[PDB]
């Protein structure tokens, strides 16, 4: 129950403090003992929640970024009934680099809510995006395999898509959350909204997250913890640390 009292302390101090109202998320920061192996790129790997949802694709504004020609992409995703109301805007990379420059990029950041791009263009994406999006780790775009078809060696790649599959993929990544792999010991992960759900949801959230990150299997995503997790601190971006689970 000490965890829950500390969460009560955090949320009530969030109510009183003028700065703490103006940032509206909760981050769990973990310190373990050992440094982690994989170098820090910027592919946010996802983490599942089992009992509690977090956000809705029918609740956030979405940007999609394509391959080059984007014609069948835009028209099919617009016209075929599973994604007709989903994405705010679809645009290709070349069209983006032509269209937005500097202050226009900052206006994009101010306006749009969550960004997803094709896997085959994520590697180049942050260079046209710059580092205003790449301040820290909130608005990191994800990557989505569009066609449910795989390119073998020495064979021409087939173009297709399906709104079915892309809608399921967005509903997964918007239901549950994502973390970033590092090299140093300390790490951070966004968990939950202060009003969208409550303290039991947050505790169950933390339990499932630490369980999925402790589990030995599912290794490309969930085997991130090496050594023992020392402690978990709950904090906002502008609040302070509250210590739980110290051993």
């Amino acid at each position: 129950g000490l965890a829950e009292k500390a969460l009560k302390a955090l949320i009530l101090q969030c109510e009183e403090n003028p700065s703490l109202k103006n940032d509206k998320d909760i981050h769990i920061i973990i310190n373990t003992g050992k440094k982690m192996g994989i170098n820090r790129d910027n592919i946010p790997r996802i983490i599942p929640l089992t009992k509690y949802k977090l956000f809705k694709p029918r609740d956030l504004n979405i940007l999609l970024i394509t391959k080059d020609p984007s014609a069948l992409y835009r028209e099919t995703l617009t016209k075929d009934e599973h994604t007709s109301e989903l994405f705010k805007e679809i645009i290709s990379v070349k069209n983006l680099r032509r269209r937005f420059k500097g202050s226009k990029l900052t206006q994009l950041y101010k306006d749009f809510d969550l960004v997803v791009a094709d896997y085959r263009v994520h590697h180049l994406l942050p260079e046209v995006l710059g580092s205003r999006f790449y301040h820290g780790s909130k608005k990191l775009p994800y990557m989505i395999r569009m066609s449910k078809e795989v390119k073998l060696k020495r064979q021409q790649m087939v173009e297709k898509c399906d709104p079915i599959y892309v809608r399921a993929q967005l509903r997964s990544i918007c239901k549950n959350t994502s973390y970033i792999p590092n090299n140093d010991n300390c790490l951070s992960v966004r968990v939950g909204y202060i009003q969208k759900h409550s303290i039991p949801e947050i505790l169950q959230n933390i339990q499932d997250t630490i369980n999925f990150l402790t589990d030995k299997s599912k290794r490309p995503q969930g085997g991130v913890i090496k050594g023992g997790i020392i402690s978990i601190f709950v904090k906002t971006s502008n609040s302070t640390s509250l210590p739980i689970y110290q051993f």
Binding site: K5, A6, A9, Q13, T240, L242
Partner: peptide, 17 residues
């Protein structure tokens, strides 16, 4: 009444070092 005591801990830790 937890927040003030833990920020107390932060301050006193640093000045103790």
């Amino acid at each position: 009444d937890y927040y003030q005591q833990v920020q107390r801990g932060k301050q006193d830790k640093k000045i103790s070092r």
